[PDB]
């Protein structure tokens, strides 16, 4: 118990919030170029003291490849901030 849900489709509001956070992280880590079209393929969630969102993301023509990236969203009543994890390269299959 306490593991991830099965992957699911990403909501419009989730794309709006998390896609630029994940792009910014991949860009600052030197993993993608600034022109990268990044797609959130799916998300799996784990409820802790807050929520872990595990994304599988795909790059477009200038950033081909897939990464797994975990984002932590804490509870409002917490001293902790929203944190993007370290991206890991994964197979798109």
Numbering used by the authors: 4 to 96
Relevant lines from the article:
We determined that FhCyLS-2 is a broad specificity inhibitor of cysteine cathepsins from both the host and F. hepatica, suggesting a dual role in the regulation of exogenous and endogenous proteolysis. Based on phylogenetic analysis that identified several FhCyLS-2 homologues in liver/intestinal foodborne flukes, we propose a new group within the cystatin superfamily called cystatin-like stefins.
FhCyLS-2 crystallized in an orthorhombic space group C2221 with one molecule in the asymmetric unit and a solvent content of 48.3%. They were located in loops at the edge of the β-sheet and indicated as D1 (Cys39-Cys66) and D2 (Cys69-Cys95). While the positions of the C-terminal disulfides (D2 and D4) were similar, the upstream disulfides formed an interloop bridge (D1) in FhCyLS-2 but an intraloop bridge (D3) in the cystatins D and F.
